[PDB]
Coordinates of C-alpha atoms in Angstrom, one line a residue:
Chain A
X1 CA 143.4 8.8 133.7
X2 CA 145.6 12.1 133.4
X3 CA 149.0 12.6 134.4
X4 CA 150.8 15.2 137.1
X5 CA 153.1 16.9 134.9
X6 CA 154.0 18.2 137.8
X7 CA 156.4 16.0 140.1
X8 CA 156.7 17.5 143.5
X9 CA 154.1 20.8 143.3
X10 CA 151.8 20.7 145.7
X11 CA 147.7 21.8 143.3
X12 CA 145.9 24.8 144.8
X13 CA 142.1 26.4 144.6
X14 CA 142.7 29.2 145.2
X15 CA 138.3 31.0 145.7
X16 CA 137.6 34.6 144.1
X17 CA 134.8 36.5 143.8
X18 CA 134.3 35.6 140.1
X19 CA 134.9 31.0 141.0
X20 CA 137.9 29.2 141.5
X21 CA 140.8 29.4 140.2
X22 CA 143.4 25.9 140.1
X23 CA 146.9 26.4 140.1
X24 CA 150.3 23.7 140.8
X25 CA 152.3 25.6 143.2
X26 CA 155.8 24.7 144.1
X27 CA 159.1 25.8 144.8
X28 CA 160.2 29.6 147.0
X29 CA 161.5 32.8 146.7
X30 CA 160.3 35.7 145.2
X31 CA 156.0 34.7 143.7
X32 CA 156.3 33.7 139.7
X33 CA 152.6 33.3 138.3
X34 CA 152.6 32.1 134.9
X35 CA 149.6 31.8 132.6
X36 CA 148.7 29.6 130.1
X37 CA 146.6 30.0 126.8
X38 CA 144.9 28.8 123.6
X39 CA 143.6 26.1 123.9
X40 CA 145.6 24.7 126.3
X41 CA 146.0 24.5 129.8
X42 CA 148.3 25.0 133.4
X43 CA 150.3 21.4 132.1
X44 CA 151.7 23.7 129.6
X45 CA 154.7 25.2 131.7
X46 CA 155.2 21.6 133.1
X47 CA 158.9 21.8 131.1
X48 CA 159.6 25.3 132.2
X49 CA 158.6 25.4 135.1
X50 CA 160.7 22.8 137.4
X51 CA 163.4 25.4 136.4
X52 CA 161.7 27.9 138.0
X53 CA 160.6 26.5 140.2
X54 CA 164.9 25.8 141.7
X55 CA 164.3 30.5 141.7
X56 CA 161.5 31.1 142.9
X57 CA 158.4 30.0 143.8
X58 CA 155.5 28.9 140.6
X59 CA 151.8 29.4 140.8
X60 CA 150.8 27.6 137.4
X61 CA 146.8 28.6 137.0
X62 CA 144.5 27.8 134.6
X63 CA 142.7 31.2 133.8
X64 CA 139.4 32.3 135.0
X65 CA 136.8 29.7 132.2
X66 CA 140.2 27.0 131.8
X67 CA 141.5 23.8 132.9
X68 CA 140.0 23.5 136.0
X69 CA 139.4 27.0 137.0
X70 CA 135.3 27.8 137.5
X71 CA 134.0 28.6 134.7
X72 CA 132.2 32.0 135.3
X73 CA 128.3 32.5 133.1
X74 CA 129.0 35.1 130.5
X75 CA 127.1 38.3 129.7
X76 CA 126.6 39.8 126.3
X77 CA 129.3 41.5 127.0
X78 CA 131.9 38.7 127.7
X79 CA 132.6 39.8 130.6
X80 CA 133.9 37.6 132.9
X81 CA 136.8 36.1 130.1
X82 CA 137.7 40.0 129.2
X83 CA 141.3 40.0 129.8
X84 CA 140.9 43.0 132.3
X85 CA 138.0 40.9 134.2
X86 CA 140.3 37.9 134.2
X87 CA 143.1 40.1 134.9
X88 CA 141.4 40.8 138.7
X89 CA 140.3 38.6 139.0
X90 CA 143.8 36.5 139.5
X91 CA 145.0 39.7 141.1
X92 CA 142.5 38.2 143.8
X93 CA 143.4 34.8 143.9
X94 CA 147.5 36.0 144.6
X95 CA 145.9 38.3 147.4
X96 CA 144.6 34.8 148.4
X97 CA 147.6 33.5 149.0
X98 CA 149.2 36.3 149.9
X99 CA 150.9 37.9 146.8
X100 CA 150.5 41.3 146.4
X101 CA 153.7 41.7 144.8
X102 CA 153.9 39.0 141.6
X103 CA 157.1 38.2 138.8
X104 CA 153.9 37.3 135.9
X105 CA 154.5 35.8 132.5
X106 CA 151.9 34.4 130.3
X107 CA 152.2 32.7 127.2
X108 CA 149.3 33.8 124.0
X109 CA 145.8 34.0 126.3
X110 CA 147.7 34.7 129.5
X111 CA 149.8 37.3 128.0
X112 CA 146.9 39.3 126.9
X113 CA 145.9 38.7 130.4
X114 CA 149.5 39.9 131.3
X115 CA 149.9 43.1 129.8
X116 CA 146.0 44.3 130.6
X117 CA 147.1 43.5 134.4
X118 CA 150.1 45.5 134.2
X119 CA 147.9 48.0 132.8
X120 CA 145.0 48.0 134.9
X121 CA 147.6 47.7 138.1
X122 CA 151.3 47.7 137.3
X123 CA 151.4 48.0 141.4
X124 CA 151.3 44.6 141.2
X125 CA 154.2 43.6 139.3
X126 CA 157.3 43.5 140.1
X127 CA 158.6 42.1 135.9
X128 CA 156.2 41.0 133.0
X129 CA 157.5 38.4 130.6
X130 CA 154.4 38.1 127.7
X131 CA 155.0 35.0 125.2
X132 CA 154.8 35.3 121.5
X133 CA 151.6 37.7 121.3
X134 CA 151.2 41.9 120.5
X135 CA 147.9 43.1 122.6
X136 CA 145.2 42.5 121.7
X137 CA 144.3 46.2 119.2
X138 CA 147.7 45.7 117.0
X139 CA 147.2 42.1 115.8
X140 CA 143.7 43.8 114.4
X141 CA 144.6 46.9 113.2
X142 CA 147.3 44.4 111.5
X143 CA 144.4 42.5 110.4
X144 CA 145.1 42.1 106.9
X145 CA 144.0 40.4 104.0
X146 CA 147.9 38.3 104.8
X147 CA 147.6 37.9 108.7
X148 CA 142.7 37.6 108.7
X149 CA 144.2 33.9 106.4
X150 CA 146.9 33.3 109.0
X151 CA 144.5 34.0 112.3
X152 CA 141.2 33.0 111.2
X153 CA 140.6 32.5 113.8
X154 CA 140.2 35.6 115.6
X155 CA 137.7 35.8 114.0
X156 CA 136.2 33.3 113.6
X157 CA 136.0 31.7 117.6
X158 CA 134.3 34.8 117.5
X159 CA 131.4 34.5 116.0
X160 CA 128.5 34.7 118.0
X161 CA 127.4 31.5 119.7
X162 CA 126.3 29.8 119.3
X163 CA 128.1 29.8 115.6
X164 CA 131.1 28.2 116.5
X165 CA 130.5 25.2 119.4
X166 CA 128.0 24.2 116.9
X167 CA 131.0 23.4 113.9
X168 CA 133.3 22.6 117.1
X169 CA 130.6 19.8 118.7
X170 CA 131.0 17.8 115.6
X171 CA 134.8 16.6 116.1
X172 CA 136.4 19.0 119.3
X173 CA 139.3 17.4 118.8
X174 CA 140.9 17.6 115.6
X175 CA 140.0 21.5 116.1
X176 CA 142.0 21.5 118.5
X177 CA 144.8 18.4 118.1
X178 CA 145.1 20.6 114.7
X179 CA 146.0 24.0 116.1
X180 CA 148.4 23.1 118.3
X181 CA 150.0 21.3 115.3
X182 CA 149.3 23.9 113.0
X183 CA 151.4 27.0 115.1
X184 CA 154.6 24.9 116.4
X185 CA 157.5 25.3 113.4
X186 CA 157.4 21.7 113.1
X187 CA 153.1 22.3 112.3
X188 CA 152.7 18.3 113.8
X189 CA 152.1 17.6 117.8
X190 CA 156.2 16.2 117.8
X191 CA 156.9 19.2 120.1
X192 CA 154.2 18.5 123.0
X193 CA 154.6 16.3 125.7
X194 CA 151.5 13.5 124.5
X195 CA 150.2 13.6 127.9
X196 CA 149.9 17.3 128.3
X197 CA 148.7 16.5 124.8
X198 CA 145.9 14.6 126.6
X199 CA 145.0 17.3 128.9
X200 CA 144.6 20.3 126.2
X201 CA 142.0 17.6 125.1
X202 CA 140.7 16.7 127.7
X203 CA 139.8 20.2 128.8
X204 CA 138.3 21.1 125.4
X205 CA 136.3 17.5 124.5
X206 CA 134.3 19.4 127.6
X207 CA 131.5 21.9 125.6
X208 CA 130.9 24.2 128.3
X209 CA 134.4 25.3 128.3
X210 CA 135.0 25.6 124.8
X211 CA 131.9 28.0 125.0
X212 CA 134.5 29.6 127.7
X213 CA 137.0 29.5 124.8
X214 CA 134.9 31.4 122.2
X215 CA 133.7 33.8 125.0
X216 CA 137.0 34.7 124.7
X217 CA 137.8 35.3 121.3
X218 CA 134.6 37.0 122.1
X219 CA 136.5 39.2 124.2
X220 CA 139.1 39.5 122.4
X221 CA 137.7 41.1 119.4
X222 CA 135.4 42.9 121.1
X223 CA 136.0 44.9 124.7
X224 CA 139.5 43.5 124.9
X225 CA 140.4 45.4 121.5
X226 CA 138.2 48.7 122.9
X227 CA 140.2 48.6 125.9
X228 CA 143.4 48.1 124.0
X229 CA 142.2 51.0 122.2
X230 CA 142.0 53.1 125.0
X231 CA 145.2 53.1 125.8
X232 CA 147.1 53.1 123.6
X233 CA 145.2 56.2 122.4
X234 CA 145.6 57.9 125.3
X235 CA 149.4 56.5 125.5
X236 CA 149.2 54.8 128.1
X237 CA 152.2 53.1 128.3
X238 CA 153.2 49.8 130.2
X239 CA 155.6 50.6 133.8
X240 CA 156.5 47.4 134.5
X241 CA 160.3 46.3 133.0
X242 CA 158.8 43.7 131.3
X243 CA 160.1 41.3 128.3
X244 CA 158.5 39.9 124.8
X245 CA 159.5 36.9 124.5
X246 CA 158.7 35.6 120.8
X247 CA 159.0 32.5 118.3
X248 CA 160.9 32.8 114.7
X249 CA 157.8 31.1 113.3
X250 CA 155.3 32.2 116.1
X251 CA 152.0 33.7 115.4
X252 CA 153.1 37.4 116.9
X253 CA 156.4 38.1 114.3
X254 CA 154.4 37.3 111.2
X255 CA 152.7 40.9 112.1
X256 CA 155.4 42.9 112.9
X257 CA 158.8 43.1 114.6
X258 CA 157.9 42.4 118.3
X259 CA 160.3 44.3 119.7
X260 CA 159.2 47.5 117.9
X261 CA 156.0 46.9 118.6
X262 CA 155.8 46.7 122.1
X263 CA 158.3 49.7 122.7
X264 CA 155.2 51.5 121.8
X265 CA 153.4 50.9 124.4
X266 CA 156.1 49.8 127.8
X267 CA 159.0 52.1 128.4
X268 CA 160.8 49.6 129.6
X269 CA 161.2 46.8 127.3
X270 CA 163.7 43.8 126.3
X271 CA 162.7 41.9 123.3
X272 CA 163.9 38.5 122.5
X273 CA 163.2 36.0 120.0
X274 CA 163.5 32.2 119.8
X275 CA 164.1 29.5 117.0
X276 CA 160.4 27.7 117.8
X277 CA 157.3 28.2 117.1
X278 CA 153.5 29.8 119.2
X279 CA 154.1 27.5 121.6
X280 CA 157.9 28.5 123.6
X281 CA 157.5 26.9 126.5
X282 CA 157.4 22.9 125.1
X283 CA 158.8 23.5 121.4
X284 CA 161.2 25.1 122.9
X285 CA 161.9 24.6 126.8
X286 CA 165.0 25.0 128.1
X287 CA 165.5 28.5 125.8
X288 CA 161.9 29.6 126.6
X289 CA 162.9 28.7 130.3
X290 CA 166.3 30.4 130.5
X291 CA 165.5 33.9 129.3
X292 CA 162.0 33.9 131.4
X293 CA 165.2 32.8 134.7
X294 CA 167.4 35.0 133.8
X295 CA 165.3 38.3 133.6
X296 CA 163.3 37.6 136.0
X297 CA 166.3 37.2 138.3
Chain B
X1 CA 112.0 15.3 97.4
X2 CA 112.8 19.1 96.0
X3 CA 110.0 21.0 94.7
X4 CA 110.0 22.9 91.2
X5 CA 110.0 26.0 91.9
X6 CA 109.7 26.9 88.2
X7 CA 107.0 25.7 86.1
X8 CA 107.1 25.6 83.3
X9 CA 110.8 26.4 83.1
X10 CA 112.8 23.5 81.1
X11 CA 115.4 21.8 82.6
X12 CA 118.5 20.7 81.1
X13 CA 122.3 19.3 81.2
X14 CA 124.9 22.0 79.7
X15 CA 127.7 20.3 78.9
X16 CA 131.3 21.4 78.7
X17 CA 134.5 21.0 78.8
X18 CA 134.6 20.4 82.7
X19 CA 131.1 19.0 83.6
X20 CA 128.0 19.3 83.4
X21 CA 126.2 22.9 84.1
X22 CA 122.4 21.9 85.1
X23 CA 120.0 25.3 83.9
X24 CA 116.0 25.4 84.1
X25 CA 115.5 27.6 81.2
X26 CA 112.1 29.0 80.1
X27 CA 110.5 32.4 78.7
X28 CA 111.8 33.4 75.5
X29 CA 113.7 36.8 73.9
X30 CA 117.1 37.9 74.2
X31 CA 119.7 35.8 76.0
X32 CA 120.4 36.1 79.6
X33 CA 121.6 33.8 82.5
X34 CA 121.3 34.1 85.9
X35 CA 124.1 32.5 88.8
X36 CA 123.4 32.4 92.3
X37 CA 126.4 32.6 94.5
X38 CA 127.3 31.1 98.0
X39 CA 125.3 29.0 100.1
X40 CA 122.4 28.6 97.5
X41 CA 121.9 27.2 94.4
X42 CA 119.7 28.5 91.2
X43 CA 116.4 28.8 93.2
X44 CA 117.0 31.3 94.3
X45 CA 116.4 33.3 91.3
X46 CA 112.3 31.6 91.9
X47 CA 110.7 35.0 92.1
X48 CA 112.2 37.1 89.7
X49 CA 112.8 34.1 86.5
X50 CA 109.1 34.7 86.4
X51 CA 109.0 38.1 85.6
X52 CA 112.3 38.1 83.3
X53 CA 111.2 35.4 81.1
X54 CA 108.4 37.4 80.2
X55 CA 111.4 39.9 78.4
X56 CA 114.1 36.8 78.0
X57 CA 114.6 33.6 77.3
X58 CA 115.8 33.4 81.0
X59 CA 118.9 30.7 81.9
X60 CA 119.0 29.5 85.2
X61 CA 122.2 28.5 86.3
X62 CA 123.7 26.1 89.1
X63 CA 127.9 28.0 89.3
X64 CA 130.1 24.4 88.4
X65 CA 130.5 23.0 91.6
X66 CA 126.7 24.0 92.3
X67 CA 124.1 22.4 93.6
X68 CA 122.8 19.9 90.7
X69 CA 125.9 20.7 89.1
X70 CA 129.3 18.7 87.9
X71 CA 131.9 19.4 90.6
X72 CA 135.2 19.1 88.4
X73 CA 137.7 18.3 90.7
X74 CA 139.9 21.0 92.4
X75 CA 143.7 20.8 91.9
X76 CA 147.1 23.2 94.2
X77 CA 145.9 26.3 92.3
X78 CA 141.9 25.2 92.7
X79 CA 142.1 26.8 89.2
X80 CA 138.6 24.9 88.7
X81 CA 136.7 26.9 91.0
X82 CA 138.9 30.5 90.0
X83 CA 136.2 33.0 88.5
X84 CA 138.3 33.4 85.3
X85 CA 137.7 29.3 85.0
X86 CA 134.4 29.5 85.7
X87 CA 133.1 32.0 83.2
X88 CA 135.0 30.8 80.7
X89 CA 132.7 26.9 81.8
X90 CA 129.7 29.1 81.7
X91 CA 131.0 30.7 78.1
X92 CA 131.4 26.9 76.6
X93 CA 127.5 26.7 77.7
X94 CA 126.3 29.6 77.1
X95 CA 128.2 27.6 73.4
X96 CA 125.9 25.5 73.5
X97 CA 123.2 26.5 73.4
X98 CA 123.8 28.9 70.7
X99 CA 124.4 32.2 73.2
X100 CA 127.7 34.0 72.2
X101 CA 126.4 37.8 72.8
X102 CA 123.8 37.5 76.2
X103 CA 122.7 39.6 79.4
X104 CA 124.1 37.9 82.7
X105 CA 123.1 39.1 86.5
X106 CA 124.7 37.6 88.9
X107 CA 124.5 37.6 93.0
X108 CA 127.5 37.0 95.0
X109 CA 129.7 34.3 93.8
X110 CA 128.0 34.1 90.9
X111 CA 128.2 38.5 90.4
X112 CA 131.8 37.7 90.9
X113 CA 131.9 34.6 87.9
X114 CA 130.4 37.0 86.1
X115 CA 132.7 40.8 86.6
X116 CA 135.7 39.0 85.7
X117 CA 133.5 37.5 82.8
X118 CA 132.8 41.0 81.3
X119 CA 136.8 41.5 81.7
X120 CA 138.3 38.4 80.5
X121 CA 135.5 38.5 77.2
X122 CA 134.6 41.3 77.5
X123 CA 132.4 40.8 74.2
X124 CA 130.6 37.8 75.2
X125 CA 127.6 40.4 77.1
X126 CA 125.3 43.3 76.5
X127 CA 125.0 44.2 79.9
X128 CA 126.0 42.8 83.5
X129 CA 123.8 43.7 86.5
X130 CA 125.8 42.6 89.7
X131 CA 124.1 42.1 93.0
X132 CA 125.1 43.4 96.5
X133 CA 128.8 42.3 95.9
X134 CA 131.6 44.4 95.8
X135 CA 134.8 43.2 93.0
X136 CA 136.7 41.0 95.3
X137 CA 140.3 42.3 95.1
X138 CA 138.4 46.2 97.0
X139 CA 137.1 43.4 99.4
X140 CA 140.5 42.3 100.8
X141 CA 142.1 45.9 100.9
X142 CA 139.5 47.0 102.9
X143 CA 140.0 43.7 104.6
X144 CA 139.8 45.3 108.7
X145 CA 138.8 44.4 111.9
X146 CA 135.2 45.3 111.6
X147 CA 135.4 43.5 107.5
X148 CA 137.7 40.1 109.0
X149 CA 135.0 40.1 112.0
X150 CA 132.0 41.3 109.3
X151 CA 133.0 38.4 106.0
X152 CA 135.5 35.8 108.8
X153 CA 134.3 33.3 106.2
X154 CA 136.2 34.7 104.0
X155 CA 139.3 33.4 105.5
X156 CA 137.8 30.5 107.5
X157 CA 136.3 28.7 104.2
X158 CA 139.8 30.0 103.0
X159 CA 141.7 27.6 105.6
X160 CA 143.5 24.2 103.8
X161 CA 141.6 21.8 104.0
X162 CA 140.3 20.0 105.9
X163 CA 139.1 22.6 108.0
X164 CA 137.1 24.3 107.4
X165 CA 135.3 21.0 105.4
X166 CA 135.8 19.0 108.7
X167 CA 134.7 21.9 110.9
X168 CA 131.1 22.2 108.1
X169 CA 130.4 19.0 108.9
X170 CA 130.1 19.5 112.2
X171 CA 126.2 21.0 111.8
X172 CA 126.0 21.1 108.0
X173 CA 122.1 22.2 108.3
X174 CA 123.2 24.5 110.9
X175 CA 125.6 26.2 109.3
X176 CA 123.4 26.8 106.3
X177 CA 120.7 28.0 107.9
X178 CA 123.2 30.1 110.4
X179 CA 124.2 32.1 107.0
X180 CA 120.6 32.5 105.0
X181 CA 119.1 34.6 107.7
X182 CA 122.0 36.2 109.6
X183 CA 122.5 38.4 105.9
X184 CA 118.9 38.9 106.0
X185 CA 117.2 42.0 106.6
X186 CA 115.1 40.2 108.8
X187 CA 117.3 38.8 111.1
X188 CA 115.6 34.8 109.8
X189 CA 115.1 32.0 107.7
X190 CA 111.0 34.5 107.7
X191 CA 112.3 36.1 104.0
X192 CA 112.5 32.0 101.9
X193 CA 110.2 29.9 100.6
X194 CA 110.9 26.5 102.7
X195 CA 111.5 25.2 100.1
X196 CA 113.6 27.1 98.2
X197 CA 114.9 26.5 101.5
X198 CA 115.1 22.4 101.7
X199 CA 116.8 23.1 97.9
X200 CA 120.0 24.9 99.9
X201 CA 120.0 22.7 102.3
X202 CA 120.6 20.1 100.8
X203 CA 122.8 20.8 99.0
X204 CA 124.9 21.6 101.9
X205 CA 123.9 18.4 103.1
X206 CA 126.5 16.9 100.7
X207 CA 131.2 16.8 101.7
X208 CA 132.2 17.1 98.0
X209 CA 129.2 20.1 97.6
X210 CA 130.4 21.7 100.5
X211 CA 134.7 21.2 99.5
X212 CA 133.5 22.7 96.2
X213 CA 132.3 25.5 98.4
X214 CA 135.2 25.7 100.7
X215 CA 137.4 25.4 96.9
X216 CA 136.2 28.4 95.3
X217 CA 136.8 30.4 98.8
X218 CA 140.2 29.6 98.3
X219 CA 140.3 30.0 94.6
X220 CA 138.7 33.5 96.6
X221 CA 141.3 34.2 99.1
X222 CA 144.5 33.9 95.9
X223 CA 144.2 33.3 92.7
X224 CA 140.5 35.4 92.2
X225 CA 142.2 38.1 94.4
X226 CA 145.8 38.4 92.3
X227 CA 143.6 38.1 88.7
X228 CA 141.9 41.1 89.9
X229 CA 145.1 42.9 91.3
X230 CA 146.3 42.2 87.7
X231 CA 143.7 44.5 86.7
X232 CA 143.5 47.6 88.7
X233 CA 146.9 48.2 88.3
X234 CA 146.7 47.5 84.9
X235 CA 143.7 50.2 85.3
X236 CA 141.3 47.5 83.1
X237 CA 137.8 49.0 83.1
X238 CA 134.4 46.8 82.5
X239 CA 133.4 48.7 79.2
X240 CA 129.9 46.7 79.4
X241 CA 126.9 48.9 81.2
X242 CA 126.8 47.9 84.4
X243 CA 124.2 47.6 87.1
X244 CA 125.7 47.7 90.8
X245 CA 122.2 46.4 93.4
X246 CA 123.7 46.1 96.9
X247 CA 121.1 45.9 100.4
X248 CA 121.0 48.3 101.9
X249 CA 121.1 45.8 104.5
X250 CA 124.0 42.9 104.8
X251 CA 127.0 44.9 104.1
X252 CA 128.6 54.5 103.3
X253 CA 131.2 55.3 100.4
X254 CA 128.5 53.3 97.7
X255 CA 129.3 50.8 96.8
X256 CA 128.6 52.4 93.6
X257 CA 131.7 54.8 93.3
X258 CA 133.3 51.9 94.0
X259 CA 132.7 49.7 91.1
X260 CA 133.0 53.4 89.1
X261 CA 136.7 52.1 90.2
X262 CA 135.6 49.5 87.4
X263 CA 132.8 50.3 84.7
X264 CA 133.1 52.8 82.5
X265 CA 129.3 52.9 82.5
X266 CA 127.8 51.2 85.5
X267 CA 124.2 52.3 87.6
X268 CA 123.1 51.4 90.5
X269 CA 120.6 52.0 92.8
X270 CA 120.4 50.6 96.4
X271 CA 117.4 47.8 97.7
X272 CA 115.6 47.4 101.2
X273 CA 116.8 44.2 101.9
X274 CA 120.0 41.8 102.9
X275 CA 122.5 40.3 101.3
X276 CA 119.9 38.2 99.1
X277 CA 118.2 40.5 96.7
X278 CA 116.3 38.2 94.6
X279 CA 114.1 36.6 97.8
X280 CA 114.2 38.9 100.4
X281 CA 112.6 42.3 98.1
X282 CA 112.1 40.0 94.5
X283 CA 109.6 42.9 93.2
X284 CA 112.7 45.3 93.7
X285 CA 115.0 43.3 91.9
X286 CA 112.9 41.9 89.0
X287 CA 112.0 45.6 88.1
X288 CA 115.2 46.4 88.5
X289 CA 116.6 43.8 85.9
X290 CA 113.9 44.6 83.7
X291 CA 114.4 48.4 83.3
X292 CA 118.2 47.7 82.8
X293 CA 117.9 44.4 80.7
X294 CA 115.0 46.0 78.7

């Protein structure tokens, strides 16, 4: 009952040491991996990936634990869902396809994998784009009253299991739809393809999937922050040429001026706002696709 | 089917212009008011009120909108559940008993009503005791990563309705038990009387009550913070003799130094317990309150 929103794209089931990664694969040219975030799946790129497919081999992957990717059993430290472990697992999956050097564009949680990848193994990346994020360290370092009210879910979803899992299970549909709507500029679901929202709703209806996402946020509050902290305090900068895009109405711009934060984190950053809320590829598919094609070409 | 945990205490329904305040009343002597917090009701004082009622007229009130007290209708600013509004209504309720100058002890949210009452109408209080709180402004000012994870519920329950209400309905029984357990020293429900836990549980099972609690935390994020800010910037201090009690577990730049910035006359001591002083450590808490109030 779930629509195929990537006409002409293949489907790959990439085995890795930490489980299978699902990905839609299309186009030809240089390899470009697209990583979605929360609470979405690979299908968030359905509006932009066709345009990228004109110039690149596009691989649109579900994150470890998300969508149709396998769910590694987490542990005390939320290890498989730290961005470092996620980045290592997606490298391994790109090596299965023979992509040892690729371009990466990530949104939300996938953008956090992406820059962590760029910090842990910058030689895997030719170029990198991150959409509407600042580093995890920066969100926490700027977590005052105003921001803690805005991204309350960073602290709520990071609470010990099973507190958020138990509250989310009463009406999953409400929460996933509330988070999709409230982060768009319009405040509703009008920007999303109804068929895309079905993918997101169904992925959220699974209790194991919701636990994974909380594990993702638990890693975000702890190991991900700690991994970021060591780098920023060591002056570890991303040497990969990168683009930072953010929505004028999105999450990253509320914390600080995004381009100036990223210049502290990478030696070669260009940045551009996009008139859109958090979900740049769906709210602003034309503007996002053009900014990505230009940067990666 | 709830237990009477105040044997001999009367049961009073106190009228105010914003709704009825429920209270257990016992003992005799000077008037002493006891205010509970989240997610509890007046019954949380059931272990120390008997010791206080040996010295005082003990008025154990459900906060406005909490327990069996009436739930006034909120507004866009959550006005009735701002600590300034709850203090004014509790002043009114005490006036209905002829109590215009009384002692006040508060825990958690009831402690925020209390210091706000001490700031707004200091002449109403002979002495003031806050249990395991700092001023709301200090919480938000200190908001960082550690604090956001620790009192996550301060931002979660402050989200616009119906987001917290909807999610609290996902499992209200678990959530109130979780809050009760997580904030103790023991980390479980062993510190609480099961008959008292039943009171907290059945109160939390009412969605209107849960909405009230969200309005309290929405106030705590906005109007209450703004009210506190004016007093910080104006250097206003509580002139009432103050006792600050806190659990050494469950929150060191000490609450004393912080409360010294808000009060001119403040004593303080830690109690070996978690967040719930009167139930985890009734003897230590009752003793401290008696020495201070008597």
